[PDB]
Each structure stands twice: as structure tokens, then as C-alpha cells.
Amino acid sequence: FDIDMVFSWVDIDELKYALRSVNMFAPWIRRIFIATDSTPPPWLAEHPKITIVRAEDHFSDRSALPTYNSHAVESQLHHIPGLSEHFLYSNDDMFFGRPLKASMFFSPGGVTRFIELEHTAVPLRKSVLIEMEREFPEEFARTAASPFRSDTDISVTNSFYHYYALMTGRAVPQEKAKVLYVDTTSYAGLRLLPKLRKHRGYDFFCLNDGFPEVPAAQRAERVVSFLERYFPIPAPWEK
Length: 239
What we know:
Blueprint: E1 3-8, H1 14-25, E2 32-35, E3 50-53, H2 70-74, E4 86-90, E5 94-96, E6 112-114, E7 122-125, H3 126-135, H4 137-144, H5 156-167, E8 171-173, E9 179-183, H6 187-190, H7 192-199, E10 204-208, H8 216-230
Parallel strand pairs: 1-2, 1-4, 2-3, 6-8, 9-10
Antiparallel strand pairs: 4-7, 5-10
Helix pairs in contact: 3-4
């Protein structure tokens, strides 16, 4: 079966390198959707593999718009036209760390494999999301219509989906994954980057922004330097 990827994004260019990590380490991905209301980045060319999806292109209710809430977008991913039944969802600060097999995320029979959750791309199914929207209609409607991140939001992609799919026999934990968290605003976190670049060992890593102690100028220099070396191949959708 096909497997697509959806990134959420709002305007270092972390997304450029997150997309390089897919091009390098998940070549089996079919379509990449960028769910965003921002102007596309200037480095991004038109390419058959990339589709920009504004909120108005997939939300059930236009009253919910405009939105500034990633949770609202996340509650409506399964309405993206053309999206495959099996897909991954990611933020722009989540990176594939080394070559991945599709079975890291989906069994050959379609069971999703979630990493217990860790801050990584998550595997989802459109049909299961349709089912949860039908079973929790007030929560899906309210979250889609919540213009800012709220305690009332259902946390579909990072928790609720996986618990629902676990209990109904459609998801199982991924016990075999190595994940590194890098706080890029601390010196201890930035010290992880040369060790990660040199020695690898991780299927996934993520670049967090903490109360920073690293000045913004130094953080950008060290992070961009790391990403340029770790992901040196420009993807075919880059100008």
C-alpha cells in the first residue's frame, strides 16, 4: 500500500532539512503534503512529490477558519484530498536519523507502529480517523474550531489516535526505535550534535527549543552547521 507524509509548518529552515531527511532515509514515501497557511519557502520549487495544503483545502467547517492552532489542523488531516489511507504526520523539527524501513511504521497488514509517545513522525490511518471523528463528533468539531492551542483540544496525532487504535486492534507499540532529544537552546543539548553527526545510532531525533541559555545567533550557527553536514544532499524539490 502507499504511504504519504504530512508536515505542518508555519513561517535555519528546519523544514528544508526535515524534508531532506525524508528524501534520504524514507524513499518509500509517495506524496509529501505541507499543511500550511504560510507563503511557501523561497527554496521550495514546484514538484510532483510536494503538495501545499491550506486549511481551507481540507477543513470540514470554514467557520473554524482562520486557524492558528496546530491541533485544529491535526484534527482534520484525514480530509486532505488525495492523501493515502496510510500516512505519517510530522512537525518541522522532527528528523529521520538514518535509513528507515517502512515496517518501522506500518506492518505489511496495515497495523500502525507508534513509538512510546516519543516526539517522532506518527503513523496514522484515514479510515480510523474518520471513525474517531464519527464517535467523538463534539470534540473533533470543537478542536477544529479552536483558533489557538487550548487545554480543551483533543491531542489526536500525539496521543488520542494511538490509544484508540491500540484498544481497537489497529495499532501496536514500536519497541525497536532509538530516539534522541536535542535541546538546541542549552549548551548540553548543542553538545549532542557533534556526537550525533559522528556516531549516529538513532532512527529519529528532534530539535527542541526550551528558558534558553544559548544566544540566538550561536544557536542558529551551530544548528545550521550540523544540519548542512548531516543532510548534505539537496532534495529534488529544492530550487
